[PDB]
Design a protein around this ligand. Structure first.
Ligand SMILES: CN(C)c1ncc(Cl)c(Nc2ccc3c(c2)CC(=O)N3)n1
Ligand SMILES: CN(C)c1ncc(Cl)c(Nc2ccc3c(c2)CC(=O)N3)n1
Ligand SMILES: [Cl-]
Ligand SMILES: [Cl-]
Lengths: 123, 4, 123, 4
């Protein structure tokens, strides 16, 4: 086509979606990880995760307001990945890299799994 | 704005 | 912070949100423009438009499944702007630039209004 | 991935 493109548009959209999340605006699901609860937008979860994409395209699960993750999933690893979904920024540290990689493999977030594998290989 |  | 960043994350999120829109997955509102109906995600509309942001943060309107735009709004100008919201690509042409600028001013999409003003000034 |  003969379209023009606004370079910062996608980043600005994501920044505003994170602002809605921080104010709990139009969040439509709560993700339960052990005792911890995380409010989010189903569409953002689907756009970032192969697991949420499969869950919310399912004719029955698409209507659930509460999703319980496998008890092996660490709430801190999930929190770091949820923050990544809404910001593109990953808080990867020596003390969390194993929990982050395991959570990303479960959530099916291929690019996060790839950087965790590379960072582990380096050490 | 750019030409993509 | 000591975060790492995935450069393509925001663009990949937006591409997946557009894929959900094209398949009519988790769309929660229909925007009526004259006779034409457009299905979309409230969160994406809010993230892109000052008008939708005001509408869906309103305690009563946040619950509406149908939003009717002012009858002066052109359905083609709206379609071009809705496509821009989900792609960062604006199909700006000599034959549509006036309708696109008027719709962007109404929707409060400041960056689109700015490029329309510059393109009109050049001609 | 980059250092932002
Ligand atoms: C694959 N597909 C057509 C598609 N359409 C829409 C959405 Cl929201 C979606 N999201 C999704 C699926 C798989 C994966 C991801 C998002 C991230 C990932 O690593 N794998 N995937
Ligand atoms: C202004 N603010 C705190 C905010 N938070 C969340 C959202 Cl979704 C939002 N969106 C929005 C508001 C105003 C404008 C836009 C989006 C685009 C624009 O040109 N003006 N604005
Ligand atoms: Cl990823
Ligand atoms: Cl804009």
């Amino acid at each position: 086509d003969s379209c023009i493109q606004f370079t910062r548009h996608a980043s600005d959209v994501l920044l505003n979606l994170n602002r809605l999340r921080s104010r709990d605006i139009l969040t439509d699901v709560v993700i339960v990880v052990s005792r911890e609860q995380f409010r989010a937008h189903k569409t953002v979860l689907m756009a970032c995760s192969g697991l949420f994409y499969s869950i919310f395209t399912d004719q029955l699960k698409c209507n659930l307001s509460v999703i319980n993750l496998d008890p092996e999933i660490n709430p801190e690893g999930f929190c770091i990945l949820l923050d990544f979904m809404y910001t593109s920024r990953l808080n990867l540290r020596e003390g969390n890299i194993m929990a982050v990689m395991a959570t990303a493999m479960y959530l099916q977030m291929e690019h996060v799994v790839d950087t965790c594998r590379k960072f582990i290989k380096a050490s | 704005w750019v030409i993509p």
